[PDB]
Write a protein that binds this ligand. Structure first.
Ligand SMILES: [Br-]
Length: 396
């Protein structure tokens, strides 16, 4: 769509609809990252009655709920309701009227009184960042939620969620998994369409200052591996997205280079020609990512660039040096590269069960494990790694 299509009267009308909804609290039922399965309960008040949040819905087609209730209070209720005592509960929560509803994002509106501190993370990208968009578009069938953690292409949280947790910030995700098989649930779109969608929802928020959002952007992996997109087209999509984000007032952006995805187990079933071909696109596109970062820095923006490509090379070249045991095999017992495998549950191999999925780089044949996503977040959070340039709150 386009944020300009939303009129002032429409904003007033939308924001004046003060309804209420319930909160679905998801948690990991098993007690380690080896088990992706999740279940849920409705959030409760302290006395056990159902918890509700007041606010308003808006959707272009995919409804988001806008509330004044803080994310920290919603999380606290879910934690109090579920009372999970194991270590990997990995609780997440969503708005829903009833059991037939999908998992809708809860957006906390900002206060009128606001300075220049970062107050949220907004993520753009593909299956390396998606936390539930293709999963909801696929009616919770893809990727299968017994084996991939509730709509994440991993066995747990992805890197953006670990960053958000470290900084105690909400994460609002626009990234869309474009893994093999996604096409059947939503036509391929660029990352610039994610920026457009985000800007339309942001127009319905109250007191929204785009300069207080930390934007994260990674894109291209699914485009190159699965869709054979040309580098020049991905360049055009990526630069168009940054133009649109900065034109809308973004100031704080985290970028990352693409990992060399030809190191993934699925390329055991590929030709050397395809390996060299995909790899070359990634090498070329990564130089464009770096050049865009340098350009926006010179233009005065707060840009960090993390060389995820170089980090992945270190992990796949010498996993033991970085706390991992295996960087060549899928942890899951998947012995081919097929889109249909995301529809089914899969067991761990004996070797992965022996060492634990936290010691593997790869979960299935394509995507990294949640331990890798954590390793990335920790590297990005490290002193001197660049996040010092953003205006974060402190928390005692
Ligand atoms: Br995977």
């Amino acid at each position: 769509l386009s944020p300009e299509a939303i009129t002032s009267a429409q904003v007033f009308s939308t924001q004046s609809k003060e309804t209420y909804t319930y909160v679905r609290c998801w948690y990991r039922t098993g007690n380690s990252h080896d088990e992706s399965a999740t279940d849920w309960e409705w959030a409760e008040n302290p006395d056990g009655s159902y918890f509700t949040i007041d606010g308003y819905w808006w959707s272009s087609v995919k409804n988001m709920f806008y509330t004044n209730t803080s994310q920290n209070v919603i999380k606290q209720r879910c934690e109090e309701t579920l009372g999970v005592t194991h270590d990997a509960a990995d609780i997440t929560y969503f708005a829903a009227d009833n059991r037939w509803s999908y998992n809708h994002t809860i957006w906390t509106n900002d206060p009128v009184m606001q300075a220049d501190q970062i107050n949220k993370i907004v993520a753009f990208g593909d299956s390396l960042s998606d936390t539930g968009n293709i999963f909801n578009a696929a009616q919770w069938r893809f990727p299968n939620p017994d084996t991939w953690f509730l709509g994440h292409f991993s066995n747990g949280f992805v890197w953006t969620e670990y960053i958000a947790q470290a900084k105690k910030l909400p994460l609002y995700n626009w990234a869309v998994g474009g893994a093999a098989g996604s096409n059947q649930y939503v036509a391929l779109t660029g990352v610039k369409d994610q920026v457009l969608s985000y800007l339309t929802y942001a127009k319905m928020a109250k007191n929204y200052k785009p300069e207080n959002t930390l934007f994260t952007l990674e894109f291209g992996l699914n485009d190159f591996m699965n869709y054979n997109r040309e580098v020049v087209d991905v360049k055009t999509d990526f630069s168009t997205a940054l133009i649109k984000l900065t034109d809308a007032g973004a100031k704080n952006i985290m970028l990352m280079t693409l990992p060399d995805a030809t190191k993934a187990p699925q390329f055991k079933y590929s030709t050397q020609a395809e390996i060299e071909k995909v790899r070359a696109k990634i090498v070329e596109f990564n130089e464009f990512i770096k050049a865009q970062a340098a350009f926006y820095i010179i233009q005065g923006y707060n840009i960090t660039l993390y060389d995820t490509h170089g980090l992945f090379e270190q992990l796949t070249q010498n996993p033991q040096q970085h706390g991992f045991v295996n960087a060549s095999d899928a942890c899951l017992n998947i012995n081919r590269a097929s889109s249909a495998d995301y529809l089914y549950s899969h067991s761990l191999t004996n070797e992965c069960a022996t060492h634990s999925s936290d010691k593997y780089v790869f979960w299935g044949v394509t995507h990294p494990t949640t331990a890798v996503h954590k390793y990335i977040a920790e590297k990005m959070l490290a002193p001197g790694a660049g996040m010092q340039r953003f205006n974060f709150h402190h928390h005692h």
